[PDB]
Amino acid sequence: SARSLGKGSAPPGPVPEGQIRVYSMRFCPFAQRTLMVLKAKGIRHEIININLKNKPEWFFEKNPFGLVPVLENTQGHLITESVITCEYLDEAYPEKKLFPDDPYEKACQKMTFELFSKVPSLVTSFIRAKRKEDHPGIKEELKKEFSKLEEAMANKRTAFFGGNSLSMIDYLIWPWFQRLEALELNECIDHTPKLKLWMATMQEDPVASSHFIDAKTYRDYLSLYLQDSPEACDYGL
């Protein structure tokens, strides 16, 4: 909850010892993966939020593509891509592992994650469509993707996606399900009983809900962000 850094800001000091730095943004569902993984693993970390509409120019040294999340370790290593940063964290900090250890069981989770692979672009295309234009086309595509997730979970008959306890796969796909209310997409999940239950269950984990934003604040952030407002990334601070 620290103000984002923007154009004309001082590039950060060296990473604190015993700490991993994450370049983030408070509303970014991709960055929330890393943050939730860092948190659920008790890894000591300093968060540096980035103003994605007023990016500090030195941030392109941290990531040529200019996207969060980004890891910076005490050694100066820079890791990019939310799924990759999480995998890097479950391997470079082999303490409380979020992936199972049996490669067959790990792969069985990665396969479940593939069922989610279309969902972020769909939600992004829904956010970036004409507001007063209610597109059934996008919403229908999400229903199909969510049906594969609904079906997938019914087959495993477990509480979570990767099994009975909370696994990496659950943090990986959660940020989008959490935003469905604010995005007024709750009808893409009407035909998904098992999914609603899993969502509720995720609301009770301390980590999956740590950075909960009321639906109201999130919609106003989107309004500012779609207008490329330099205040979007810090709205609500």
Added chain:
Amino acid sequence: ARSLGKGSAPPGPVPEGQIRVYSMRFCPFAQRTLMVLKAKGIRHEIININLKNKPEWFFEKNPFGLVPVLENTQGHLITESVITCEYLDEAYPEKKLFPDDPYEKACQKMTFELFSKVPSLVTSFIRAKRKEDHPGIKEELKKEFSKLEEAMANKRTAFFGGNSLSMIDYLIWPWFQRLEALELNECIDHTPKLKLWMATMQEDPVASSHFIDAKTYRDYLSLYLQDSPEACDYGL
């Protein structure tokens, strides 16, 4: 080996000391697994599937009916090309294809992300109107390949993951291998380093195993776009 199709006998249980791979001889996704099975000396039996006359029993092997699919002597079923490859490097640490430093592993997975759009683009190019395909697609491939060209220019190494052949190289190879057959050779005109990497990959023994000439590949596609039950076995 001839593909298995509708009305065929489901295969016997996987021989011990052997891992089964459900494949298709022209499939670039399965080519990932096969090259990984090869370059790691893993003993494996290949079962090609007729993707235009799928045997009904293949859907118990994969509800989605896609290849590649792994089956081990224990009956474990692994799906998705990248997942089968990662599984193989983790159940068989003889000849490591990923580096062991997580940062360097991550640095290769990050490089792989530059490739993520390329397979769907190529599929869209293949399934477009034969006469007057689309320069629009070709432009998206040019932009996508620019990220790979620059990435290799930045690392200034012979391969993508460093100086020896890494998982990353086998992961993205099948599509560059087909650029000739697909007549996309102009999407790589402004990519000097890529051309070089391609030439080198044709000389790797694994990346060239069971070589398919551009004409044969072109004929397989033609039969495949017409849903021919003979596309998968064409050329045997």
